[PDB]
């Protein structure tokens, strides 16, 4: 059951891959200015 996960090994792609990409995304996120802007969207990128 759960997310179609009838074998524990299936949890390895479902966690390691989202984390790894997130780590890459972290290198993006730390680069961006994370201050408030008070606008409809943030043009700083």
């Amino acid at each position: 059951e759960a997310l179609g996960v009838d074998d524990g090994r299936l949890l390895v792609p479902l966690v390691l891959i989202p984390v790894f990409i997130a780590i890459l995304f972290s290198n993006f996120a730390s680069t961006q200015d994370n201050e408030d802007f008070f606008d409809t969207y943030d043009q700083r990128r």
């Binding site: 890459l24 995304f25 290198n27 993006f28 680069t31």
Partner: protein, 327 residues
């Protein structure tokens, strides 16, 4: 540029690619390609599928005695119902092919792909700085496809009731749907017919009026299409002349003087019609069938005087008995 992920994002959302990918395309391309190749392989060489679940398979593949017209990807077995049936949930690959698993694979990946196509149309509209409502127009065929492929099996309880991925299978789906639900008498299919007929009429009318009032920018020895240059800032046809012709063909009041309003109506009419017919299919999936005017006329003695609706019901009954192989 700043980071590896930033470079990947710049490449994904780049307008310099021959075909725009975008984040919606990141989901659209794999699903659409998978569904395409599985559909081709199944249409060429799939084994026959026991669609009715009573151990009498139906062939729909070219290698099993079908042509292009009669070939189809047979819907999943009635024993499967609407159970999720991937390859790994079948005991063997032969069992998966025998129960119509490739139909479920193609349908699911194709629905994901068309949702990604809607999102990708919006995404490239946003990237180009244009207005985003082309995807709203494209929702109508997507809605119709989801109604004939997903919503109707959900309401009926089996993917075997879905439309087969073929030509003769499509005709069989239409005939069985008419027999079961009398879709011709359903007002939403009537609205869809009005939508498609009006779309054809309005496309022909708009093309005729624009082509009729083409401003002379060419000689007799060449095609008139060369009178228009790509990227030119001037209008290639006289709106006033076409408006006058249309307002003289009918009464003066009936005309679309505003070109933007005319094109908005052109976009609106068939999209609304297809939306209505998709909604009708969705409603009839839960047995909200069309109008029933059977036995609407009787004489003084009480005998039923038949109408054209009675003849339509006779045809529907003739189809119904053939479709139901059981009592």
């Amino acid at each position: 540029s700043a980071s590896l992920w930033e470079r990947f994002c710049s490449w994904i959302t780049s307008t310099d690619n021959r075909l725009y990918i975008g984040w919606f395309g990141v989901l659209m391309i794999p699903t659409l390609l998978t569904a395409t190749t599985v559909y081709i392989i199944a249409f060429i060489a799939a084994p026959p599928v026991d669609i009715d679940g009573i151990r009498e398979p139906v062939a729909g593949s070219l290698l099993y005695g079908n042509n292009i017209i009669t070939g189809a990807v047979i819907p999943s077995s009635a024993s499967i119902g609407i159970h999720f049936y991937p390859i790994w949930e079948a005991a063997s690959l032969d069992e998966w092919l025998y129960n119509g698993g490739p139909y479920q694979l193609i349908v699911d990946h194709f629905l994901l792909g068309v949702c990604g196509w809607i999102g990708r149309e919006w995404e490239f509209s946003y990237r180009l700085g244009m207005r985003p409502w082309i995807s709203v127009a494209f929702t109508a065929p997507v809605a119709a496809a989801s109604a004939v492929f997903l919503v109707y099996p959900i309401g009926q309880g089996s993917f075997s009731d879905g439309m087969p991925l073929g030509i003769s299978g499509t005709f069989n789906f239409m005939l069985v749907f008419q027999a079961e639900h009398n879709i011709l008498m359903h007002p939403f299919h009537q609205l869809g017919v009005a939508g498609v007929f009006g779309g054809s009429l309005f496309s022909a009318m708009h093309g005729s009026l624009v082509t009729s009032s083409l401003i002379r920018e060419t000689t007799e020895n060449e095609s008139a299409n060369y009178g228009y240059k790509f990227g030119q800032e001037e209008e290639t046809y006289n709106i006033v002349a076409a408006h006058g012709y249309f307002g003289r063909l009918i009464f003066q009041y009936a005309s679309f003087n505003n070109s933007r309003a005319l094109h908005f109506f052109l976009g609106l009419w068939p999209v609304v019609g297809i939306w209505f017919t998709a909604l009708g299919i969705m409603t009839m999936a839960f047995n909200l069938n069309g109008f029933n005017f059977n036995q609407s006329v009787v004489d003084s003695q009480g005998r039923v005087i038949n109408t054209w609706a009675d003849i339509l019901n006779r045809a529907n009954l003739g189809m119904e008995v053939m479709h139901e192989r059981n009592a």
